[PDB]
Design a binder for this molecule. Structure first.
Ligand code: FAD
Ligand code: FAD
Ligand code: COA
Ligand code: COA
Ligand code: ADP
Lengths: 555, 554
C-alpha cells in the first residue's frame, strides 16, 4: 500500500479508535488527530460518576493522555484545535488554534469526521439568566458542575429530561446528598423502554426519594433559575438545574462543505462510512445508521457503535472490506440506584410507529437458583414476530444478572437467531450463576409457546376492557396471594385445585387466566385448552399489572 | 388419543420430561418412578449445604412429591426401584425399596433418565474406611453433615480435583476444616487447560488448601485415617471425599439388550430413541455428540439433562421435532473468590484428535477501569486459523466471567466465527463493561491471527525459542518489571521502541512480550511494518509467570 495523509476530526470514541488501528495498519501514513477540547479519549461515560463522587480521581477520566498516545502510535495530536471549515475540492481543512488564535490550512488525502453530538439547549425564557443551569458533555462541563456543588452547597437539584443520562445524573446527585426532582415531558423515564417496564424503574427511583414529574416541561425559569415554572403551572424551588434533553449531531462541518445529511441532520454515509465526498468519511454520534433489526435509517448515539465504527473504518481505508458495518442494534444499559435496566432492538412504541405486527412476553425468573443465597428477580420482556420468531427487541431489569441476560439476547439477535433458538442456548449453570434453564432459555420457551400456538395471551393494558366486555377472569393464585391485590372482576380458583373444580369453569364464556407472574396462569391455560376451553393467559400476571396500573388494583 | 408414558428417574431429566408431557397432553397417563425418597432435589446445591452456605435443608427440595403430583396429575412413585425392563412384554419390574416386594407395570412409551453414579476405585483398605463418602443424593449429604457434626473432623482429604471435588474442597475449607486435595493429573479441573489451571491452583493455595498432583491413594490404613500415597507421602486425615468421576447408570438398558455407547452410556439417536423404538433415554446416562466436532462422548451436566427432557416431551407430544444438535459442554464452577468457566473443547482433546488450532489468552477488565472495583477477566479462545471456527473457550476471574462465557457459548451454538465476535454489540455503561467488551477484545485478538496481522508463540514455547536463537524483547515500562521477566528478555519499553529501532537486530527472528499481550501485539504490528520477522508471546509475562513461576528471572 501507498502511504497517505489522514486527518481525523474529533479525538474521543470514534476518532481515537480509528487513529490507533490506522497506525497498526501502517507505519508510513501521516496521521493527524484534531480535537477542540483539551483532552483526547476521555471517559465521557464516567462523567456522572465523577460528579457523584463514585469516581474519586479526576485523572481516571483520562483514558489516554496526548503525550502517551502520540508517542505510542506516532500520532500528530492537536488538542485545543478547532476545525472551522472543510474545503473539499481543495482537500484541506481550516484549523484554529484556540490558545494562540492562529489559523491555518491542513491538506489531507483522507478526512475522517467523528465530531460527535452536542446537548440540545431549549429556548426556555430565562435560560440565559439561569446561573446554576448545566449541560453535560465534556470534562470542563464536569469540573464546572462539581465546582458548583462543592462551593455553593446546593440542597436541591432539578434534572430536566429522563433519558439514560438524566437518570444517571439523578442518582449521582442523590449520592452527594442533594435532593432531586426529575422533570419529564413524556409519561415515563427512559425512552428506549416501554411504559410498563418504566413503571418498575419509577418505583425504584421514588424509593430513593426522587420526585418524579411527568407530562410536564419547564415553561419558564424565574429568579435566575431558582424558580422553575412548569407548563402545568406548578413551581419547583431549586438550587441547580441539569439539562439532559437529548443530543443533536455535530454536522455543521458537513453542512458547510455541502455534504449530504441524513435523518435528524446526521451526516449521511454509505456502507463504508463514506460521505457524499469520496475522500471524506464519518463515524460516531454524528452519522446516520440503519438499525440492525429493521434497517431503518436512524441516529443511535452510543459508545460501542462509535468504537466499532472507528475500528472498522481503519480496515476499510486499507481496503479490508470483507466485513462492513451491519447497523446499530441499540444495546444499552443503565444503573438506576439498585437496579440495572437494559434494552436492545426495538420497543413497542417504535414498532407501532413502523406498522410492524408483533407479540410480547414478560418473564420474571431468578438471577440464579432460588435455593442458593441472594437470588433476585430478573424481568425479561421479549418482542417478536408471531410467525417467523424474528426477535425485534428485548428489555430487562433487576438487581443482578441483567447485563448478562441482555448480552446473550443481543448476541442472539445479531447472530440472526429467532425466539425458537433461545431455549437451546447452552449457558453456564451452577447454583451461584444461573438455573438449569437460564432466564434467557425461559423467556425463549414462553415466546416459543406463542409462536407454536400452545398459548394465546392478552396484555396488562387489555385485560380490564376484556372484563368490562364480559371476559371471565380466573385468578389461579392461592387465596393468601390475593391480599397483595387483584385485577377487578377476578374469580379465584387456585391452580392446584383447578383440575378438581372444572365444573366451576363456564364453557359459554371466553376464559382469561392470571396468576402472579404468568407461569401458573400458563399451566392453567394449557390444561383448559386441552379440555376444549377457549382460554388466554394474562402475560406477566398480577405482579406486572399491579406495577403499571396500581390505581386499578382491587383489594 | 391417549398413551401410557413411564418415566424412570424423578430428578433433572425425569421431572423435566414429565412436566412438559403433561402440559402437552391432559389425556396421557404419566407415571414417574424414583428409587430415592425425593424428586427434583437440588443435586447441585448439595456441596453448599455441606459448607453451611445453604442453611435450610428444606431449600434443597425444589418440589415435593405431593405438590407436583397434584399440579401435573402425575403418578409419582418414590422409594421404587425399576429392576428390569421387559421390552418384549412392554413392561417394567418395580421393587419397593422399603419391603423388597416387586410388581410389573406396562408401558406404551418408556423414558430412562437414571443419571450417573460415582466411580469407586479399588483402594486397599477402602472397605474399612468409616469416614469415606461419595456425594450424589440427599442421604449422602445428610451422612456427610452428620459425620462432621458428630466427629468434628480437623482435616479432610478430597480424592479427585474435578469440578465437584473442587467445590467440596471449598465448602469443607470454609467450615474451618483443613483440606488436602489429591489428584492423579498435573492439574485440577480436566475441562480447562494446564496454564488456566495454574490460576486456580494459586488461588486454592492462597486459601490454604494443600494440593497434591500426579499422585494417588495406594492404601487406606487405620480405618481410613491414614492415607498412603503412591509417592510415599502419608496423609493423616479425619474424613475422605471421593470425587473421581461418574459412570452412566445404564444397567437397565444393558440388561434389556439396548445398544451402548462410549463409557457404557445408553446409545440414542437424534430424537433420544434407544435401539428399541418404544424406549427413550436422556440425561447423564446417554451418549451425546459434542457440538463442536460431533464426536461421541458423555457430558453429565444439568442444562443438557433439563433441555433433553423438554425436547423429548415435544418429540412425543409437541409440534415439529427439533433434533438435539449435541452438547457444547458449557460449564462453570465457583472456586473460592474465582469463577472458572469452560465451553467446547480444550487443547488436550484437540491434540488427541490431531485437529489443528490456534489459541489466544486475552485478559481484560470486567468493566471500564475508570469505574470502581473492575477486576480482570482472562479469556482463552481456541480456534481454527483458516476458518475462524471456534473450538472452545475457557474463562476465569473474580466477576463478569459467567457473562463472558455465556456470550461466547451463544456465539458458538449460533455458528459464529472468531471474526464475528468483535461485532457483538453488548451492553456498555461504566459499571457493566467497556466500549469494547472482553468478548469483542478476544475476538479482535483471534481475528488478527486469522487475518495474518500478527503471528504468535505460547508460554510453553518461548524458553525453547530463546535457547535456540530467538531474540526476545520485553516492551513493558520498567516499573512493570516488579514480578520478574522471561529469561533472556531485553527491555525496550513500547513507547520508546520506535525511537530505538536501531537496537533491534534485523537478521534475527524477533519475539516480543509485554505484561498481558496487548502492547506486545502493538510492538509486533510496528516491527512487521518495518520489515522484521516477529512473533508476540500470547498472554505476555502475567500468563507465563503464573504457569511457570520457577522459571521467572529477576
Ligand atoms: C454524560 C454522558 C454519558 C454517557 N454514557 C454512555 C454510556 O454509558 N454508554 C454508552 O454507550 N454511551 C454513553 N454516552 C455516549 C458516548 O459518549 C458517545 O456515544 C460517544 O462518545 C460518541 O463518540 P464520537 O466519537 O462520535 O463523539 P465524542 O466522543 O463526543 O467525540 C467527538 C469529539 O470531537 C470534537 N469536535 C467536534 N467538533 C470539532 C471540530 N469542529 N474541531 C475539532 N474537534 C471537534 C469534540 O470536542 C469531541 O471531543 C454518554 C455520553 C455522555 C455525554
Ligand atoms: C454434588 C453434585 C453437584 C453438581 N453440580 C452441578 C452443577 O453445578 N452444574 C451442572 O450442570 N451439573 C451439576 N451436577 C450434575 C447434575 O446433577 C446432573 O447432570 C443431572 O442431575 C443429570 O440429570 P439426570 O436426570 O440424568 O440424573 P439425576 O438428576 O441424577 O436423576 C437420576 C435419578 O434417577 C434415579 N434412578 C436411577 N436408577 C433408577 C431405577 N432403576 N429406578 C428408579 N430410579 C432410578 C436416581 O435415584 C436419581 O434420583 C452435579 C452433580 C452432583 C452429584
Ligand atoms: C482506548 C482507545 C484509544 C482505543 O485505542 P486502541 O489502541 O484500539 O486500544 P484498545 O484497548 O481498544 O485495543 C484493542 C486492540 O488490542 C488488541 N488486544 C487487546 N488485548 C490483547 C491481548 N491480551 N493480546 C493481544 N492483543 C490484544 C485487540 O486485538 C485490538 O487490536 P486491533 O484493534 O488491532 O485488532 C479508544 O477506545 C478510546 O479513546 N476510548 C475512550 C473514549 C470512549 O470510548 N468514549 C465513549 C464514552 S466511554
Ligand atoms: C423444575 C422441574 C420439576 C421441571 O418442571 P417445569 O414445570 O418444567 O418447571 P420449569 O420452571 O422448568 O418450567 C416453566 C414452564 O413455564 C413456562 N413459563 C415460565 N415462566 C413463565 C411466564 N412468566 N409466563 C408464561 N410462561 C412461563 C415455561 O415456558 C415452561 O413451560 P414449557 O416448558 O411448557 O414452555 C425439573 O426441571 C427439576 O426437577 N429441576 C430440579 C432438578 C435439577 O435440575 N437437577 C440437576 C441438578 S440441580
Ligand atoms: N485414582 C485417582 N486418584 C486421584 N484423582 C483421580 C483418580 N482418578 C481420577 N482422578 C481425577 O478425579 C477428577 C474427576 O473429575 P470429574 O470427571 O469432574 O469427576 P466429578 O464429576 O465427580 O467431579 C479428575 O480430575 C481426575 O483426573
Amino acid at each position: 500500500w501507498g502511504s497517505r495523509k489522514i486527518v481525523v476530526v474529533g479525538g474521543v470514541a470514534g476518532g481515537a479508535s480509528v487513529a490507533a488501528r490506522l497506525r497498526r495498519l501502517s507505519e508510513e501514513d501521516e496521521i493527524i488527530m484534531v480535537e477542540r477540547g483539551e483532552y483526547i479519549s476521555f471517559a465521557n461515560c464516567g462523567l456522572p460518576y465523577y460528579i457523584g463522587g463514585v469516581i474519586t480521581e479526576r485523572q481516571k477520566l483520562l483514558v489516554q493522555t496526548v503525550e502517551r498516545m502520540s508517542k505510542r502510535f506516532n500520532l500528530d495530536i492537536r488538542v485545543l484545535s478547532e476545525v472551522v471549515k472543510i474545503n473539499k475540492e481543495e482537500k484541506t481543512i481550516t484549523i484554529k488554534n484556540v490558545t494562540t488564535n492562529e489559523t491555518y490550512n491542513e491538506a489531507y488525502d483522507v478526512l475522517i469526521l467523528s465530531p460527535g453530538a452536542k446537548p440540545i439547549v431549549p429556548s426556555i425564557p430565562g435560560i440565559e439568566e439561569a446561573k446554576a443551569l448545566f449541560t453535560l458533555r465534556n470534562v470542563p462541563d464536569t469540573d464546572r458542575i462539581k465546582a458548583y456543588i462543592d462551593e455553593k452547597k446546593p440542597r436541591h437539584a432539578t434534572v430536566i429530561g429522563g433519558g439514560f443520562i438524566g437518570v444517571e445524573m439523578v442518582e449521582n446527585l442523590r449520592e452527594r446528598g442533594i435532593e432531586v426532582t426529575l422533570v419529564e415531558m413524556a409519561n415515563q423515564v427512559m425512552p428506549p423502554i416501554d411504559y410498563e417496564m418504566a413503571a418498575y424503574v419509577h418505583e425504584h427511583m421514588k424509593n430513593h426519594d426522587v420526585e418524579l414529574v411527568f407530562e410536564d416541561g419547564v415553561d419558564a425559569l424565574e429568579e435566575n433559575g431558582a424558580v422553575v415554572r412548569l407548563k402545568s403551572g406548578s413551581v419547583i424551588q431549586t438550587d441547580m438545574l441539569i439539562l439532559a434533553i437529548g443530543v443533536q449531531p455535530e454536522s455543521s462541518l458537513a453542512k458547510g462543505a455541502g455534504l449530504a445529511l441524513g435523518v435528524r441532520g446526521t451526516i449521511k454515509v454509505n456502507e463504508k462510512f463514506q460521505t457524499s465526498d469520496p475522500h471524506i468519511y464519518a463515524i460516531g454520534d454524528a452519522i446516520e445508521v440503519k438499525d440492525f433489526v429493521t434497517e431503518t435509517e436512524t441516529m443511535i448515539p452510543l459508545a460501542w457503535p462509535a468504537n466499532r465504527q472507528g475500528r472498522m473504518l481503519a480496515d476499510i481505508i486499507h481496503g479490508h472490506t470483507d466485513s462492513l458495518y451491519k447497523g446499530t442494534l441499540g444495546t444499552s444499559v443503565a444503573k438506576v440506584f439498585d437496579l440495572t435496566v437494559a434494552t436492545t432492538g426495538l420497543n413497542e412504541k417504535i414498532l407501532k410507529r413502523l406498522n410492524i405486527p408483533y407479540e410480547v412476553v414478560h418473564v420474571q425468573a431468578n438471577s440464579h437458583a432460588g435455593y442458593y443465597p441472594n437470588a433476585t428477580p430478573v424481568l425479561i420482556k421479549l418482542i417478536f414476530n408471531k410467525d417467523s420468531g424474528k426477535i425485534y427487541g428485548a428489555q430487562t431489569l433487576g438487581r443482578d444478572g441483567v447485563d448478562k441476560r441482555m448480552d446473550v439476547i443481543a448476541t442472539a439477535i445479531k447472530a440472526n437467531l429467532t425466539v425458537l433458538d433461545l431455549p437451546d442456548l447452552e449457558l453456564s449453570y451452577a447454583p451461584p450463576y444461573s438455573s438449569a434453564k437460564d432466564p434467557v432459555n425461559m423467556v425463549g420457551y414462553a415466546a416459543s409457546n406463542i409462536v407454536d400456538g400452545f398459548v394465546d395471551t392478552v396484555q396488562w393494558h387489555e385485560i380490564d376492557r376484556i372484563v368490562e366486555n364480559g371476559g371471565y377472569l380466573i385468578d389461579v393464585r392461592e387465596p393468601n396471594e390475593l391480599k397483595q391485590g387483584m385485577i377487578k372482576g377476578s374469580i379465584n380458583i387456585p391452580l392446584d385445585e383447578l383440575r378438581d373444580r372444572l365444573e366451576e369453569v363456564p364453557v359459554d364464556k371466553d376464559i382469561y387466566i392470571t396468576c402472579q407472574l404468568g407461569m401458573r396462569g400458563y399451566v392453567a391455560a394449557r390444561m383448559l385448552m386441552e379440555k376444549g376451553y377457549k382460554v388466554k393467559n394474562v402475560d406477566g400476571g398480577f405482579k406486572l399489572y399491579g406495577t403499571v396500573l396500581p390505581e386499578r388494583i382491587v383489594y
